[PDB]
């Protein structure tokens, strides 16, 4: 465990970073990448015990500065890149402590962001003035901003399709989109009752788990558009983040 930040943790990712001076021990150590509330991004080396080949550096390898509050973080699937989100989105390099490349529509704010799995240089983000934005890293420019009725919370990409993503709009709805045409949403899911906090694809690209402010977790298939299962307990209250497993069984 690590007492990371004095503020609220607003984001977390794991990755295998690459540094120019040395390649870190990815086998014996995994790597968090946190995101604070008070202008702080911190790397964390985490010792694991999945390998008996080995037998220090127990945590806090590097820190990153900030001028405004950060609301979210997402790590690129390749080339050890990651971008923050908050009052102003800017990309970050592991080897560079400087703010690398700053992006904005005008004066706008961001509550979450998510890289895709395939065609990996596509970074999507959710704005705060009910807006969903898209970027392409290899073009070094954002693409567009689809605006909605009222704001959303979370986005995650389909791993098997790579142009489809699920958005969690703070009514009782989750929306299924396509990057080619954003005006025709491919599917909707409307089986909740309150604001939805999180959505996560299955790694087999078939089912989408989700969770809302009412104490419930909905699972639905991609095609059906209605929740096939509801999980709930009295011992749960107000789920905020829900993810699949990596083998889609948990």
């Amino acid at each position: 465990s690590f007492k990371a930040h004095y503020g609220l943790v607003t984001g977390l990712c794991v990755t295998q970073p690459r540094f120019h001076d040395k390649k870190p021990d990815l086998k014996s150590q995994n790597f968090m990448l946190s995101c604070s509330d008070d202008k702080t991004v911190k790397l964390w080396s985490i010792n694991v015990d999945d390998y008996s080949n080995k037998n220090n550096e127990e945590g806090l390898i590097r820190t990153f500065d900030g001028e405004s509050a950060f609301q979210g973080i997402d790590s690129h699937r390749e080339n050890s890149t990651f971008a923050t989100g908050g009052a102003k989105i800017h990309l970050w390099d592991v080897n560079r402590l400087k703010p690398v490349s700053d992006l904005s529509w005008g004066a706008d704010n961001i509550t979450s962001l998510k890289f895709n799995q395939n065609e990996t240089d596509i970074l999507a983000s959710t704005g705060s003035d009910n807006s969903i934005v898209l970027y392409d890293l290899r073009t070094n420019s954002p693409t567009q901003k689809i605006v909605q009725t009222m704001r959303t919370n979370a986005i995650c990409w389909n791993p098997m399709e790579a142009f489809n993503f699920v958005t969690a709009n703070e009514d009782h709805n989750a929306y299924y989109y396509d990057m080619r045409n954003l005006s025709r949403s491919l599917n909707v899911f409307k089986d909740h009752v309150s604001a939805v906090m999180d959505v996560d694809f299955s790694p087999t690209g078939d089912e989408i788990v989700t969770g809302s402010y009412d104490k419930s977790i909905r699972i639905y298939k991609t095609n059906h558009g209605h929740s096939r299962e509801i999980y709930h307990t009295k011992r749960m209250q107000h789920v905020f983040q829900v993810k699949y497993s990596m083998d889609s069984k948990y």
């Binding site: 689809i146 605006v147 909605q148 025709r184 949403s185 104490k215 509801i230 709930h232």
Partner: protein, 51 residues
């Protein structure tokens, strides 16, 4: 289909389903009176617009 949901979910869903069905027939009488309004798809009703 049947699953045990709490009454916190169930009671508010009843109010939502009453209000949503209220919205449906309050648009249907507008559909009968007005001649040809746009038949907006439910996949398109949640977008204010694009760029």
């Amino acid at each position: 289909r049947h699953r045990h949901v709490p009454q916190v979910i169930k009671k508010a869903q009843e109010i939502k389903n009453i209000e949503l069905s209220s919205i449906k027939r309050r648009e249907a009488n507008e559909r009968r009176t007005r001649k040809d309004m746009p038949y907006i798809s439910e996949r398109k009703k949640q977008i204010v617009g694009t760029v």
